[model samples]
Target: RCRHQFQTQQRLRACQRVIRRWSQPPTLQRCCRQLRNVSPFCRCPSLRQAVQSAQQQQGQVGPQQVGHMYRVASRIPAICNLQPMRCPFR
Candidate 1:
């Protein structure tokens, strides 16, 4: 089971913003503030689903986009200064 933040559609925007391309620190700072509530166990899967679906929303999707999404997802823990700095999955 995931946290409410991960499960709810309302927080989908927050998740999307976290991995958005060309994200500024201010953007991540705001987005990650919400993500910090998620436990490490949920972060990877949540991020995976988030990034996957986030990309799906676009009419145009490519490996380059997917790679960037995952890259950003993997960086949140460190960027957000979350506890248990390593994500369980990459």
Candidate 2:
């Protein structure tokens, strides 16, 4: 849920922390189920960028661990669609 606004730093931290935790299992192969669940947050450019960039940062991952995520992500239902956003870098 994007229960949020860029009006405060704490909100940003809360968003980033959840994403970081979801992406941190076994180091850094992102879980699409987690990503899908948090897809609502993608509305906020900051969270989208935060989440996508974090997802992209897999230092030494291979297909065995990667393929499942796209399936999970694919299952996510579409929301309102993309909006112009400015991702916060923390």
Candidate 3:
């Protein structure tokens, strides 16, 4: 999980770098191409959609908002198994 997190962070950083370098919004094709080069695990169409949405809203939305949306939409499902604790006290 740690390794996956590290890799994900790296990929996100790369994506951010591309965003910073390009003054214009990335087309779906450009976004997908950069995403594919950075992380194969992020190849889902929905993921691409979310990134494009973020790009579109970049001026209106803050980083925290973008991060929250990504986490809630993506990683929250994978981490759902660890939720719901069993409390002996209860």
Candidate 4:
């Protein structure tokens, strides 16, 4: 939980700093690229859609939101004995 929060915050801040400094937003693919060593999680299509909409509109999100997701998803995956999931836009 703490790890996710810390890392996502770093990523978000870096993204914001880069965008502001360069006056250019990252491509959606770049925005959604997976962080190395981060565990995967499953999201409903609705959440996925929402994320796409959110990023497309602003190219950014609160770091805590990213942390919250990983924290939430982490809770269930272990007990559910996680399986491979193909993530769209991730």
* The candidate that achieves the highest TM-score relative to the unseen native structure: 1
- TM per candidate comes to 0.72, 0.28, 0.27, 0.24
Error of 2 at 82 (Å): 14
lDDT (10s digit) by residue, model 4, range 1-90? 524532453333332322333332443223233222234432222223333333444646577654444333233223233333333334
Supply candidate 2's per-residue lDDT for 51: 41
Model with the higher TM-score, candidate 2 or 4: 2
Model 2 misplacement above 4 A: 1-11, 25-42, 52-90
Per-residue lDDT tens digits for candidate 1, residues 28-85, read: 6665765676666666667777777677666676777778777777777777787655
Query: Candidate 4: lDDT of 49?
Result: 31
Instruction: Return model 4's CA RMSD, one decimal.
Output: 11.7
1 or 2: which has the higher lDDT? 1
Give the lDDT of residue 14 in candidate 3.
37
Model 1 clash pairs? Answer: none
Winner on lDDT (3 vs 4):
3
Candidate 4 positional error at 44, Å: 18
List model 2 lDDT by residue over 34-67, tens digit each.
Answer: 3333434443433443444435545654554333
Task: Go through the candidates in order and give each one's C-alpha lDDT.
Answer: 0.66, 0.36, 0.39, 0.35
Task: Write down the RMSD of candidate 1 (Cα, Å).
Answer: 3.2
Q: What is the C-alpha RMSD of each candidate to the true structure, in Å?
A: 3.2, 10.0, 11.6, 11.7
Q: Could you tell me how far off, in angstroms, the CA of residue 49 lies in candidate 4 after the best superposition? A: 16
Using lDDT, give the best candidate's number: 1
- Which 10 consecutive positions of candidate 3 have the poorest summed lDDT? 81-90
lDDT winner, 1 or 4: 1
Q: In candidate 1, residue 11 scores what lDDT?
A: 53
Q: Rank the candidates by TM-score, best first.
A: 1, 2, 3, 4
